[PDB]
Amino acid sequence: KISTSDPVRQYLHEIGQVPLLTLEEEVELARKVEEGMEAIKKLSEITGLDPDLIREVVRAKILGSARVRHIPGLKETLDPKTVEEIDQKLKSLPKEHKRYLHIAREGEAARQHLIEANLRLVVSIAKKYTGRGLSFLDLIQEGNQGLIRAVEKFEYKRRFKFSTYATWWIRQAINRAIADQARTIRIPVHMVETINKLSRTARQLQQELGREPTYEEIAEAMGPGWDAKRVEETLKIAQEPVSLETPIGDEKDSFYGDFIPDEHLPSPVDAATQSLLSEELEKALSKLSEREAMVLKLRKGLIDGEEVGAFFGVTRERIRQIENKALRKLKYHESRTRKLRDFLD
């Protein structure tokens, strides 16, 4: 039906059936998550397999079958045979190392378990970074990605609990998202805060003047290197675009995007131009010397805009020689049979 409610209910229901106890459960899971790490690494140590491979195989066996490997990550790990081979060596690990295998999986689980339990935490946080320009669900989702981030770095050895830790790692993820996706024309985090400070300042300035500050105040109040050109520029980037498709005039049925003209396209007038220009330019180019004329015709009209580097083997003296003498005979007879004079431009 309506999407917010359903997810809310969805995780709230699961937290409702499994919140994590203050100390015990978060401690428990944590301990298991870390042992998994220590396990996986020791596993890479004895198998010679990359911790990345050991991590993905335990993931498959605990989180999902061939289905989750094939669709998400295209196909480099054979759906059945590949992962299985890896699990076999894990079994072969006698009593000593087999232990790390069994631990890794259980740890992987714990992880995923703690992640579930602390989803209310995200939404509670994400709840306040609402009106920033992101969808509540988008916001929670990024914040969610943030909690997963915290899970990788939390050191249970250092007594503090995951609550305060997740807060940071989540708030970071959210604010970035807000800065990276909110606008249609991407704006770096610095420009963002910049804009916030700019806005905030315009607020304190609105406070007393009764005059929406000229870009003079803003410069001053802002700080060290702020000037009128700077603020006029920032607020120009601050305005989000407009809907190319928008109801205009009397909204009866007006759509904004038809009114903008086109530039690259040669309005007939220009196509006719290129025709005569090229035909006449082509006639002159032939009744001459295919030497310094093509040099300057090709150097100027074919690739990019170098007198010396313009002519093949013949130096500058013959260049200027024929350039200026051919260019003028060409111009002065074109003066006789006036075809070019009427500036095609």
Partner 1 sequence: CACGKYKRQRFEGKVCERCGVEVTKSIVRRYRMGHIELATPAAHIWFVKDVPSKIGTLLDLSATELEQVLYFSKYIVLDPKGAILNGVPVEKRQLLTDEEYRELRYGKQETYPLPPGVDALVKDGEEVVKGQELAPGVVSRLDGVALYRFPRRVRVEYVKKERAGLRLPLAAWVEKEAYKPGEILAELPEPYLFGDKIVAAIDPEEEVIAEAEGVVHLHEPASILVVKARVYPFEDDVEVSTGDRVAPGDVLADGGKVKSDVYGRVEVDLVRNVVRVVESYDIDARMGAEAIQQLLKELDLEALEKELLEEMKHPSRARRAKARKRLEVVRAFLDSGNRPEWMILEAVPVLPPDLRPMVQVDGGRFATSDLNDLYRRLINRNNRLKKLLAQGAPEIIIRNEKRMLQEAVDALLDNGRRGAPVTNPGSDRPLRSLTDILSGKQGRFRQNLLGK
Contact with partner 1 (CB under 8 A) among 53, 62, 310, 326 = 62
Task: For the segment 306-345, give every residue that binds partner 1 (CB under 8 A).
Answer: none
CB of 294 vs partner 1, minimal distance in Å: 13
- Residue 258 DSSP one-character state: G
- Confirm whether residue 5 is marked as ligand binding: no
CB of 224 vs partner 1, minimal distance in Å: 26
What the block records as the tokens of 73 is: 């990550």
CB of 237 vs partner 1, minimal distance in Å: 9
- How buried is 235 (Cβ within 10 angstroms: 0-12 exposed, 13-18 middle, 19+ buried)? middle
- How buried is 84 (Cβ within 10 angstroms: 0-12 exposed, 13-18 middle, 19+ buried)? middle
Which distant-in-sequence residues (6+ apart) come within 8 Å of 69 by Cβ?
Answer: 60, 77, 79, 83
Q: What are the angstrom distances between the C-alpha of 214 and each of 116, 217, 219, 235, 243?
A: 51, 6, 9, 12, 28
State yes or no: residue 172 binds partner 1 (CB under 8 A): no
User: Rounded to whole angstroms, how far apart are CA atoms 245 and 91?
Assistant: 62
User: Three-state SS across 94-116?
Assistant: CHHHHHHHHHHHHHHHHHHHHHH
Contact with partner 1 (CB under 8 A) among 96, 253, 279, 345 = 253
User: Rounded to whole angstroms, how far apart are CA atoms 329 and 325?
Assistant: 6
What the block records as the tokens of 339 is: 């075809």
Contact with partner 1 (CB under 8 A) among 153, 190, 203, 236 = 236
- Confirm whether residue 253 is marked as ligand binding: yes
Pattern 71-110, binding to partner 1, x per CB under 8 A?
xxx-------------x---x------xx-xx--xx--x-
What 3-state class would DSSP assign to 344?
coil
Task: For the segment 24-43, give every residue that binds partner 1 (CB under 8 A).
Answer: 24, 27
State yes or no: residue 227 binds partner 1 (CB under 8 A): no
Sequence ranges of the binding site: 76, 92, 219, 223, 226, 250, 253, 339, 342
Residues that bind partner 1 (CB under 8 A): 2-3, 6-7, 10-11, 14, 21, 23-24, 27, 59, 61-63, 65, 68, 71-73, 87, 91, 98-99, 101-102, 105-106, 109, 111-112, 115-116, 119, 133, 135, 137-138, 140-142, 144-145, 148, 151, 181, 184-185, 236, 239-247, 253, 255-257, 260, 264-265, 301-304
